[PDB]
Every structure is written in C-alpha cells, then in structure tokens.
Amino acid sequence: KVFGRCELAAAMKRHGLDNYRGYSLGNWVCAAKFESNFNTQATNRNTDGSTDYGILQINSRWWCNDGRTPGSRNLCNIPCSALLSSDITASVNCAKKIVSDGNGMNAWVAWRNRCKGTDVQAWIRGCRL
Ligand SMILES: [Cl-]
Ligand SMILES: [Cl-]
Ligand SMILES: [Cl-]
Ligand SMILES: [Cl-]
Ligand SMILES: [Cl-]
Ligand SMILES: [Cl-]
Ligand SMILES: [Cl-]
Ligand code: NA
C-alpha cells in the first residue's frame, strides 16, 4: 500500500509513535517519506547482502528474519515479509525497538541526513490528527 501523508500520520499516531522516545510524529512521517515514499512494499538490498523492508526500511541484519542474511539476528521476532503488510503494526512495533537501541532515530541514515534539524512539523501540517 502507498499511504497518503496525513493517512500515515494518523496510523502512526494510533499505534503510539507520536513523541515515542521524544520524537514528534513529523520525525516519523519524514523518515517514512525518504525511506519508502510511504510504500509498505519498498525493499532495498544492501552491499552486505542484508535487505531493508517496508515503510521504515527495517534491515534484516538485526531486526527480522528473511532466511538469506548469514549471521543475522531477528530481534523483532518477525518474518521480514510482515514489514511489507498494508497494516503497519509490525513496522511500528519493530521501529519502537530500534529507536530504543541507544542512537535514537540516528539508526535511520535517511532521518539523520534529510530530516534531523529540519522543520519536521511541516510533515503533519494540514492533517486532522
Ligand atoms: Cl508528501
Ligand atoms: Cl512534528
Ligand atoms: Cl537469515
Ligand atoms: Cl534473534
Ligand atoms: Cl521467520
Ligand atoms: Cl495500519
Ligand atoms: Cl534520543
Ligand atoms: Na535477520
């Protein structure tokens, strides 16, 4: 599924991402925009042979099992395929684990490089939340 901007903001708020570990909802929407363009079916193969999955491009090296990332972990205890669902529950639950890991949202290179320090509230402007 390709979410609308305000549609995704609403889904992320209902699943308790708004101000999760102190990151306002606009941070999460900005991250999803540059990671996946709001497309739950987004995938990206890394040079190390790991893969990124779903709206927040969660990686198979630590967070999910895809059966093809040698030596990897599955800390969210999910198949990577769950991260491509039209239902973002698995993606939000796993993101909560990642953002708790010690580096906050810096875990998302695209958030650091394109969202951090910007007017992220722009991403929820207009939305009935
Ligand atoms: Cl947009
Ligand atoms: Cl915000
Ligand atoms: Cl594996
Ligand atoms: Cl594991
Ligand atoms: Cl699995
Ligand atoms: Cl959803
Ligand atoms: Cl933090
Ligand atoms: Na894995």
From Swiss-Prot:
Family: Belongs to the glycosyl hydrolase 22 family.
GO cellular component, one term: extracellular space
Main localization category: secreted
Chain sites annotated for binding substrate: D101
Keywords tagged on the record: Allergen, Antimicrobial, Bacteriolytic enzyme, Disulfide bond, Glycosidase, Hydrolase, Secreted, Signal
GO biological process per UniProt: cell wall macromolecule catabolic process; defense response to bacterium; defense response to Gram-negative bacterium; defense response to Gram-positive bacterium; killing of cells of another organism
The keyword RNA-binding belongs to this UniProt entry's keyword annotation: no
Species this chain originates from: Gallus gallus (Chicken)
Protein name: Lysozyme C
Subcellular location: Secreted
Note: Lysozyme C is capable of both hydrolysis and transglycosylation; it also shows a slight esterase activity. It acts rapidly on both peptide-substituted and unsubstituted peptidoglycan, and slowly on chitin oligosaccharides.
